[PDB]
Amino acid sequence: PWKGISGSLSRISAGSVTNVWGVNAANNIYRYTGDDAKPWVQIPGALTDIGAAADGTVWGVNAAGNIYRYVWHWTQIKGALKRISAGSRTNVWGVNAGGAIYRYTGDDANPWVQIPGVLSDIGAGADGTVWGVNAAGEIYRYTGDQGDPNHWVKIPGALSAISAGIKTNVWGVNSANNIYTSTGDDKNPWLGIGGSLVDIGAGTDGVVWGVNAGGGIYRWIRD
Amino acid sequence: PWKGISGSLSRISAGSVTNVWGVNAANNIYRYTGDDAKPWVQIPGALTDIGAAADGTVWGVNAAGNIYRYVWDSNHWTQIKGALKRISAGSRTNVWGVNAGGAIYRYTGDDANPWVQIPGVLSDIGAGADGTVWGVNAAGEIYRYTGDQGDPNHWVKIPGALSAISAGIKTNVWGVNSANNIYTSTGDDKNPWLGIGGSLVDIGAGTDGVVWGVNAGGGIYRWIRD
Amino acid sequence: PWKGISGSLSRISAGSVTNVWGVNAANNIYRYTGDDAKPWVQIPGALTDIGAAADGTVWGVNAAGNIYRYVWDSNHWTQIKGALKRISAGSRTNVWGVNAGGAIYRYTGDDANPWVQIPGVLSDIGAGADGTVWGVNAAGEIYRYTGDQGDPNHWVKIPGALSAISAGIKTNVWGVNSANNIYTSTGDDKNPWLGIGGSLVDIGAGTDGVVWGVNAGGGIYRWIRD
Amino acid sequence: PWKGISGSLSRISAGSVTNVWGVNAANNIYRYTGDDAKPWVQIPGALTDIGAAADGTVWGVNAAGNIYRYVWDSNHWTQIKGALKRISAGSRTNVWGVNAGGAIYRYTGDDANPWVQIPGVLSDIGAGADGTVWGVNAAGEIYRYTGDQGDPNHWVKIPGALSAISAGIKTNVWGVNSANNIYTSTGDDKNPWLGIGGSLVDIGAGTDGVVWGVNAGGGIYRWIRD
Ligand SMILES: CO[C@H]1[C@H](O)[C@H](O)[C@H](C)O[C@@H]1[Se]C
Ligand SMILES: CO[C@H]1[C@H](O)[C@H](O)[C@H](C)O[C@@H]1[Se]C
Ligand SMILES: CO[C@H]1[C@H](O)[C@H](O)[C@H](C)O[C@@H]1[Se]C
Ligand SMILES: CO[C@H]1[C@H](O)[C@H](O)[C@H](C)O[C@@H]1[Se]C
Ligand SMILES: CO[C@H]1[C@H](O)[C@H](O)[C@H](C)O[C@@H]1[Se]C
Ligand SMILES: CO[C@H]1[C@H](O)[C@H](O)[C@H](C)O[C@@H]1[Se]C
Ligand SMILES: CO[C@H]1[C@H](O)[C@H](O)[C@H](C)O[C@@H]1[Se]C
Ligand SMILES: CO[C@H]1[C@H](O)[C@H](O)[C@H](C)O[C@@H]1[Se]C
Ligand SMILES: CO[C@H]1[C@H](O)[C@H](O)[C@H](C)O[C@@H]1[Se]C
Ligand SMILES: CO[C@H]1[C@H](O)[C@H](O)[C@H](C)O[C@@H]1[Se]C
Ligand SMILES: CO[C@H]1[C@H](O)[C@H](O)[C@H](C)O[C@@H]1[Se]C
Ligand SMILES: CO[C@H]1[C@H](O)[C@H](O)[C@H](C)O[C@@H]1[Se]C
Ligand SMILES: CO[C@H]1[C@H](O)[C@H](O)[C@H](C)O[C@@H]1[Se]C
Ligand SMILES: CO[C@H]1[C@H](O)[C@H](O)[C@H](C)O[C@@H]1[Se]C
Ligand SMILES: CO[C@H]1[C@H](O)[C@H](O)[C@H](C)O[C@@H]1[Se]C
Ligand SMILES: CO[C@H]1[C@H](O)[C@H](O)[C@H](C)O[C@@H]1[Se]C
Ligand SMILES: CO[C@H]1[C@H](O)[C@H](O)[C@H](C)O[C@@H]1[Se]C
Ligand SMILES: CO[C@H]1[C@H](O)[C@H](O)[C@H](C)O[C@@H]1[Se]C
Ligand SMILES: CO[C@H]1[C@H](O)[C@H](O)[C@H](C)O[C@@H]1[Se]C
Ligand SMILES: CO[C@H]1[C@H](O)[C@H](O)[C@H](C)O[C@@H]1[Se]C
Ligand SMILES: CO[C@H]1[C@H](O)[C@H](O)[C@H](C)O[C@@H]1[Se]C
Ligand SMILES: [Mg+2]
Ligand SMILES: [Mg+2]
Ligand SMILES: [Mg+2]
Ligand SMILES: [Mg+2]
């Protein structure tokens, strides 16, 4: 099931059990302390989406679309994005307000390359896994680095938010707030997990965190 | 070549050099200690197959078909609903099994609804930390999973014949045939197996390259490269 | 058994076979080179404890209690505000320490506000790449962190007595007691430790299975399995 | 020291102990089997440089400059548009090359638009699983990539001279100079290299610490620590 963790967040990302970040409705930024009794520290800045990777990589975008990378507070990286996901230093993707899709090049002076397609959310994993959903709710998995010249393969179902920590840990929520996890069977690809969430973050190590419409925060209790 | 390790085991699984478990003919459970002078510690419980992952995840099944996950606390094991005969854990997120009728199952991550059936028929399976999955059927035919890579037939047949298989990562795949001959994957599907000297009935191939096996008389071996 | 490695060190930390660091009695800092013929290179600075992670992260504290993180450039170290006496780095995201009054701290990832106090009292701590954390208190009592797993008491006591502890991953946990006796975790909380021949005063257990130690006379050892 | 391994190779790359590939003077391709008694299996195709990652990713270039990625199925290789002379694969997401005019390229993850030029001029490059990238230029000057860390000049020069370099992770960086002398990085940019006994013309340094090399007469060696 799910365990409630005190606090309020509107978007959340989990790269690993030790790297979990979110933003609240007001755009305040928080990182998970590892202490469930005192679970958040506020990190200076303002963001509306955030992507936290297994290796400690953290990227975010603000309401205007400005893009930032955490420097271990924030360095702006040129461009404009509306949603962002970071699975690792080398696998960072986002989408802009118009739905265009970009992947980070690793060159801060020329930081994005556009990837053909249209998406409204995206999840990028440490292992290179990339999944997305479009405005209508259609679901895609990236194949453009695997020889597919149409880049994306549609996977049945409908989701509004998605997160991929690894090939084997992919979760999303539909517009109704129903929660799904990928089965690993493209012909029968989702299994419903009880609960209601509006955003979700799935880590490479299996950790899964989510927030519901009211801002309540949950960690999946797999044991 | 192989280094002989003291003790007696019937099935074995290796996820990493620090997470290697086995079961003996009496169904006792043992974990490798890291010291070849005192290699095994008995973990309470009874199992007939076991899967141990690099991330620490350990799953097992017993003679009745009951399914267990190790909980790393003083309760030791939790029973997960269902019935399985063989099991393999590549990681927390990549756990597969085969039931007594040869049906194939993948763990869903929901203990309340824990398995989805994956099409096919197998007799042994090996799952890895990177999502890699290989299986063998009762006639010895060998398959690698493709159902998460857009293949509507779920599995691709790889030439050869094996009776047990293990695949802790895409790059470390090993099996044995019914005659106890040992093979490792070349990574070339058109020339897929290299014979390795020795004799084993079960094998465990870790994500980190460790390889452990057991032979028909209970003898235990670890692979030595240097 | 242990292989003796030349040189002299007082404390040691191993994150992986390629990231092993120590300090000597003079507070000089050394990094393992990967060649047992010329095993140490002195890194400029002065420290009394050090934590080295598999991901390359290295943290240290000096005799004054000052806290440093290695920056992997010609500046070498950056001072992080606060005071600590012992430190362990499992990864960039999992760094813990204990101060001179036994209070426990976890790194927040914000150098401007770097520590949160975790309830408890300890004298040594070992943090891993998977989030695993073990500690010991001054009476030798042993604890494993549970405060990120819903436990309002933050730690579970594990039977036994140790004075130094290291835990680079859930599956590779080692310690020494005040008499210099060496123990490794069995993974069974009801039968938790296996004695290992040898004698050490500090130990470092890597994510990849590497294990290094130092003895009371400064002697340095690496664990050999094969 | 080095262990000699049978066979003959001209260039080599090691991503992990289980993913090591090379090419010989005839441009034949070989993969390491894991058994030093029968160490190589020829993989069909022709290449002049190769990069093999810990995650299984393998890229290569041929004498014409054509670029290939291994597809782990019976087709073996897929050609990727462009021309390169040297290549290194740290992981699926971190692949770099140098073309015959010394221009530097990073893989974009889009086979239809596969390369972005990174400013600079190099003659060899080594990329790691953690994003680490090192290069050398034709005069032997050594650089480490900083262009993803806010540096508008993209590279920092590290003292010394090398002709081939490999960097499977931040903590395992090795090279050779034009005189075939072997060096490993100390992690101290002000005292950056340790000389290692032996003689090699190419080297591959894995994410897991494995190190392989080849010498001018085709001789193949693996580094042994214990
Ligand atoms: C993460 O939850 C936040 C919440 O969003 C509020 O900002 C509140 C004032 O602070 C809590 Se953290 C105690
Ligand atoms: C990440 O937070 C940003 C914020 O969104 C504003 O752009 C502000 C002007 O700069 C801060 Se960076 C401290
Ligand atoms: C990622 O930022 C994008 C931005 O969203 C615009 O599409 C702009 C036309 O292109 C930049 Se990338 C130069
Ligand atoms: C991922 O982008 C999708 C897009 O959202 C549309 O569904 C379009 C019809 O197909 C593309 Se896939 C090139
Ligand atoms: C993930 O897609 C879901 C979809 O959102 C609907 O809830 C539908 C009723 O079930 C599908 Se899963 C067959
Ligand atoms: C994660 O789903 C939550 C849901 O959002 C509601 O808060 C409900 C009251 O509790 C469930 Se937890 C089964
Ligand atoms: C692992 O080998 C075991 C063996 O299976 C027997 O249980 C025997 C009683 O003890 C040996 Se060593 C623990
Ligand atoms: C793993 O061992 C199992 C055992 O096989 C029995 O099913 C017993 C009922 O439960 C133990 Se675990 C309490
Ligand atoms: C994995 O367990 C299977 C079991 O073997 C049976 O096929 C049963 C009909 O379905 C269950 Se799925 C809980
Ligand atoms: C893996 O399952 C195999 C099965 O063993 C049979 O060979 C059957 C003819 O093919 C299925 Se693949 C759908
Ligand atoms: C792995 O398959 C083996 C098979 O089991 C037989 O030993 C056969 C003689 O050789 C094949 Se490898 C061509
Ligand atoms: C690591 O051992 C050191 C030792 O601590 C002394 O600094 C000595 C001067 O040199 C030996 Se070897 C570098
Ligand atoms: C790690 O070494 C430290 C040292 O202990 C001193 O505190 C000195 C003030 O700073 C050096 Se790093 C400049
Ligand atoms: C980690 O440093 C601690 C320090 O030891 C003191 O307890 C001080 C009162 O609080 C600081 Se937290 C910056
Ligand atoms: C880890 O801290 C321990 C402490 O050392 C004491 O044993 C105390 C009685 O228990 C606390 Se656990 C809240
Ligand atoms: C790790 O704990 C040790 C302890 O330090 C003593 O050596 C005691 C005699 O044995 C216990 Se292990 C039962
Ligand atoms: C890897 O070494 C090879 C060598 O390059 C030659 O192709 C030779 C014909 O066979 C040796 Se061993 C496969
Ligand atoms: C990797 O080998 C290549 C080879 O070099 C040739 O370019 C040929 C045209 O293609 C083979 Se792969 C079909
Ligand atoms: C990597 O290939 C390069 C190539 O070497 C040339 O510089 C060409 C002008 O640009 C291509 Se980028 C497809
Ligand atoms: C890596 O490229 C180097 C290049 O080799 C030259 O040394 C040039 C003077 O500096 C560039 Se760094 C912009
Ligand atoms: C790696 O750089 C080497 C260089 O190649 C020369 O061997 C020189 C004599 O020594 C430097 Se290391 C100071
Ligand atoms: Mg997201
Ligand atoms: Mg098995
Ligand atoms: Mg320590
Ligand atoms: Mg190379």
Nearest CA to ligand 8 atom 10: B45
Cα–Cα distances in angstroms (integers) from residue D208 to residues B194, D14, D16, D17, D101, in the given order:
24, 9, 5, 7, 32
Dihedral sign computed on CA atoms, order D152, D154, D158, D159: negative
Beta B49-52 vs C182-185: how paired, if at all? unpaired
Q: Residue A18, Cβ neighbours under 10 Å: how many?
A: 30
Q: Do D35 and B208 touch (CB under 8 A)?
A: no
Task: State the ligand closest to the CA atom of B23.
Answer: 7
Which one-letter amino acid corresponds to residue B171?
T
Closest CA to B84 of B31, B47, B127: B47
Contact C202, C164 (CB under 8 A): yes
Q: Do D171 and C18 touch (CB under 8 A)?
A: yes
Rounded Cα gap, residues A194 and B111, in angstroms: 12
Closest CA to D91 of D61, D148, D133, D123: D133
User: Nearest-5° angle of CA A68, CA A71, CA A74?
Assistant: 35
* Helix (H), strand (E) at residue C205: strand C202-205
Q: Residue C166, Cβ neighbours under 10 Å: how many?
A: 28
Contact D108, D95 (CB under 8 A): no
Rounded Cα gap, residues D157 and D151, in angstroms: 13
Rounded Cα gap, residues D146 and C73, in angstroms: 11
Residue A119, ligand 4, Cβ within 6 A? yes
- Expressed in angstroms, the distance from the first to the final Cα of chain A is 9
Three-state DSSP state, A174: coil
* Helix ranges, B127-171 (H): none
For residue D70, the Cα-to-chain-centroid distance in whole angstroms is 16
Q: Which of B156, B189, B209 sits opposite D16 (nearest CB)?
A: B209
Contact C125, C86 (CB under 8 A): yes
For residue C215, give both structure tokens: 């003895």
Rounded Cα gap, residues D34 and B217, in angstroms: 25
Contact C129, A15 (CB under 8 A): no
Contact C120, C141 (CB under 8 A): no
> What secondary structure does DSSP assign to D159-213, as a single string?
SS--SEEEEEETTEEEEE-TT--EEEE-S-TTS-EEEESS--SEEEE-TTS-EEE
Rounded Cα gap, residues C81 and C85, in angstroms: 13
- Expressed in angstroms, the distance from the first to the final Cα of chain B is 9
Give the strand order in the sheet containing B2-5. B2-5, B220-223, B211-214, B202-205
Rounded Cα gap, residues C79 and A67, in angstroms: 28
Query: Which of B6-35 are b and which e, b meaning 16 or more Cβ less than 10 Å from the residue's Cβ?
Result: eebbbbbbbbbbbbbbbbbeeebbbbbbbb
Residue D55: is it exposed, middle or buried by C-beta count within 10 angstroms (0-12/13-18/19+)? Answer: buried
Provide residues with CB under 6 Å of ligand 15.
C 119-122, 135, 137, 141, 143, 153-155
Q: Which residue has the tokens 């340095």?
A: C220
Rounded Cα gap, residues A23 and A10, in angstroms: 6
CA of D45 to the centre of ligand 18 (A): 5
Beta bridge partners of D187: none
Candidates C2, C5, C13, C18, partner chain D, best to mutate (most D CBs within 10 A): C18
> What secondary structure does DSSP assign to D136-166, as a single string?
E-TT--EEEE-TTTT-TT-EEEESS--SEEE
Closest CA to C220 of C208, C203, C207: C203
For residue A199, give both structure tokens: 């955003």
Candidates A17, A18, A31, partner chain C, best to mutate (most C CBs within 10 A): A18
Closest CA to B197 of B207, B210, B184, B187: B184
Which one-letter amino acid corresponds to residue C210?
V
For residue D205, give both structure tokens: 């340094």
Three-state DSSP state, A143: coil
Query: Which of A61-95 are b and which e, b meaning 16 or more Cβ less than 10 Å from the residue's Cβ?
Result: bbeeebbbbbeeebeebeebbbbbbbbbbbbbbbb
Which one-letter amino acid corresponds to residue C81?
K
Experimental resolution (Å): 1.6
Rounded Cα gap, residues A103 and D75, in angstroms: 28
Q: What is the dihedral of CA B95, B96, B97, B102, to 10 degrees?
A: 170
For residue A129, give both structure tokens: 């896994």
For residue C31, give both structure tokens: 């990094």
Diameter of chain B measured on Cα atoms? 49
Domain ranges of chain A: 1-223
User: Nearest-5° angle of CA B176, CA B187, CA B53?
Assistant: 60
Contact B6, B220 (CB under 8 A): yes
For residue A25, give both structure tokens: 């409705």
Q: Which of A89, A144, A147 sits opposite D148 (nearest CB)?
A: A89
Beta A161-166 vs A169-173: how paired, if at all? antiparallel
Question: Where does chain D break, by residue before each gap (C–N > 2.5 Å)?
Answer: none
* Helix (H), strand (E) at residue D119: none
Beta bridge partners of B109: none
For residue B153, the Cα-to-chain-centroid distance in whole angstroms is 23
Closest CA to C90 of A89, A19, D146: A19
Q: Which of B19, B36, B37 sits opposite C171 (nearest CB)?
A: B19
Under 8 Å CB-to-CB from A9, ≥6 apart: which residues?
Answer: A22, A23, A24, A30, A211, A215, A217
Cα–Cα distances in angstroms (integers) from residue A71 to residues A152, A203, D145, in the given order:
32, 21, 16
CA within 13 Å, CB half, D192: 19
SS (H, E, C) B162-213: CCEEEEEECCEEEEECCCCCEEEECCCCCCCEEEECCCCCEEEECCCCCEEE
Q: What is the dihedral of CA A62, A65, A70, A71, to 10 degrees?
A: -130
Rounded Cα gap, residues B88 and A185, in angstroms: 17
- Expressed in angstroms, the distance from the first to the final Cα of chain C is 9
Contact C212, C223 (CB under 8 A): yes
Which one-letter amino acid corresponds to residue D17?
V
Provide residues with CB under 6 Å of ligand 21.
D 160-162, 177, 181, 183, 193
Residue C199: is it exposed, middle or buried by C-beta count within 10 angstroms (0-12/13-18/19+)? Answer: middle
Cα–Cα distances in angstroms (integers) from residue D73 to residues B89, B175, B185, C183, D55, in the given order:
24, 19, 13, 46, 16
For residue B201, give both structure tokens: 């009935």
Give the strand order in the sheet containing B104-107. B86-91, B94-98, B104-107, B115-118
Rounded Cα gap, residues D221 and D178, in angstroms: 18
Closest CA to D91 of C17, A204, B109: A204
Q: Could you give phi then psi for residue A54, rounded to 5 degrees?
A: -60, -35
Rounded Cα gap, residues B157 and A112, in angstroms: 40
CA within 13 Å, CB half, C182: 23
Q: Do B41 and C208 touch (CB under 8 A)?
A: no
Q: Do C34 and D223 touch (CB under 8 A)?
A: yes
Q: What is the dihedral of CA C73, A127, D41, B138, to 10 degrees?
A: 150
Contact C24, C32 (CB under 8 A): no
Beta bridge partners of C60: C50, C68
Closest CA to B53 of B5, B102, B7, B87: B87
CA of C225 vs chain D CAs: smallest distance (Å): 10
Residue D112's region, left for phi above 0, alpha for psi from -120 to 50, else beta, is alpha
Closest CA to D30 of B188, B160, B206, B175: B188
Under 8 Å CB-to-CB from B2, ≥6 apart: which residues?
Answer: B198, B213, B221, B222, B223, B224
Beta bridge partners of B107: B115
CA of A130 to the centre of ligand 4 (A): 14
Three-state DSSP state, A150: coil
Residue D12's region, left for phi above 0, alpha for psi from -120 to 50, else beta, is beta
Closest CA to C172 of C147, C204, C149, C145: C204
User: Nearest-5° angle of CA D131, CA D134, CA D137?
Assistant: 150
Rounded Cα gap, residues C29 and A177, in angstroms: 53
Residues of chain C in contact with residue A18, where contact means CB-CB under 8 angstroms, are 90-91, 93-94, 131
* Residues belonging to chain C with any Cβ–Cβ distance to chain B shorter than 8 Å: 1, 130, 156, 169-172, 184, 186-191, 194, 196-197, 208-209, 211, 223, 225-226
Q: What is the DSSP letter of C185?
A: E
Candidates C130, C146, C157, C171, partner chain B, best to mutate (most B CBs within 10 A): C171
Rounded Cα gap, residues A61 and A67, in angstroms: 5
Residue C80, ligand 14, Cβ within 6 A? no
Under 8 Å CB-to-CB from D161, ≥6 apart: which residues?
Answer: D139, D140, D141, D142, D177, D178
Of ligand 9's atoms, which has the minimum distance to the CA of residue B97? 1
Closest CA to C18 of B100, D79, D210: D210
> What secondary structure does DSSP assign to C130-169, as a single string?
TS-EEEE-TT--EEEE-TTTT-TT-EEEESS--SEEEEEE
Q: Which of B171, B190, B211 sits opposite D19 (nearest CB)?
A: B171
For residue D178, give both structure tokens: 């034009």
Residue A149: is it exposed, middle or buried by C-beta count within 10 angstroms (0-12/13-18/19+)? Answer: exposed
Rounded Cα gap, residues D165 and D12, in angstroms: 11
Rounded Cα gap, residues D96 and A191, in angstroms: 38
Cα–Cα distances in angstroms (integers) from residue D54 to residues A4, B26, B92, C100, D19, in the given order:
37, 38, 20, 41, 6
Rounded Cα gap, residues D95 and D82, in angstroms: 14
User: Nearest-5° angle of CA B145, CA B151, CA B153?
Assistant: 75
Residues of chain C in contact with residue B208, where contact means CB-CB under 8 angstroms, are 208-209
Which one-letter amino acid corresponds to residue C34?
G
Cα–Cα distances in angstroms (integers) from residue C41 to residues C20, C35, C38, D193, D224, in the given order:
11, 11, 8, 10, 19
Q: Residue A16, Cβ neighbours under 10 Å: how many?
A: 24
Provide residues with CB under 6 Å of ligand 9.
B 81-84, 99, 103, 105, 115
Rounded Cα gap, residues D51 and D117, in angstroms: 19
Query: Which of B80-116 are b and which e, b meaning 16 or more Cβ less than 10 Å from the residue's Cβ?
Result: beebbbbbbbbbbbbbbbbbeeebbbbbbbbbeebbb
Rounded Cα gap, residues D203 and D193, in angstroms: 15
Contact C100, C65 (CB under 8 A): yes
Rounded Cα gap, residues C22 and C9, in angstroms: 6
Contact A66, A77 (CB under 8 A): no
Closest CA to A163 of A80, A82, A84: A84
Rounded Cα gap, residues B75 and C156, in angstroms: 14
Contact A192, A180 (CB under 8 A): yes
- Expressed in angstroms, the distance from the first to the final Cα of chain D is 9
For residue A21, give both structure tokens: 């970040």
For residue C80, the Cα-to-chain-centroid distance in whole angstroms is 18
Which one-letter amino acid corresponds to residue D4?
G
As a whole number of Å, the CA-based R_g of chain B is 16
Dihedral sign computed on CA atoms, order D169, D56, D121, A67: negative
CA within 13 Å, CB half, B78: 12
Three-state DSSP state, B40: strand
Rounded Cα gap, residues D221 and D226, in angstroms: 15
Q: Which of B71, B78, B147 sits opposite A187 (nearest CB)?
A: B147
User: Nearest-5° angle of CA D192, CA D197, CA D198?
Assistant: 115
Contact A180, A159 (CB under 8 A): yes
Contact D171, D187 (CB under 8 A): yes
Three-state DSSP state, B109: coil
Residues of chain D in contact with residue C92, where contact means CB-CB under 8 angstroms, are none
Q: What is the DSSP letter of D101?
A: T
Residue-level length of chain D: 226
Q: Could you give phi then psi for residue B105, rounded to 5 degrees?
A: -135, 145
CA within 13 Å, CB half, C125: 31
Q: Do B41 and C170 touch (CB under 8 A)?
A: no
As a whole number of Å, the CA-based R_g of chain D is 16
* Helix (H), strand (E) at residue A22: strand A19-23
For residue B29, give both structure tokens: 């459970």
Q: Could you give phi then psi for residue A125, rounded to 5 degrees?
A: -100, 165
Rounded Cα gap, residues D16 and A209, in angstroms: 32
Residue D152: is it exposed, middle or buried by C-beta count within 10 angstroms (0-12/13-18/19+)? Answer: exposed
Closest CA to D206 of D155, D171, D181, D182: D171
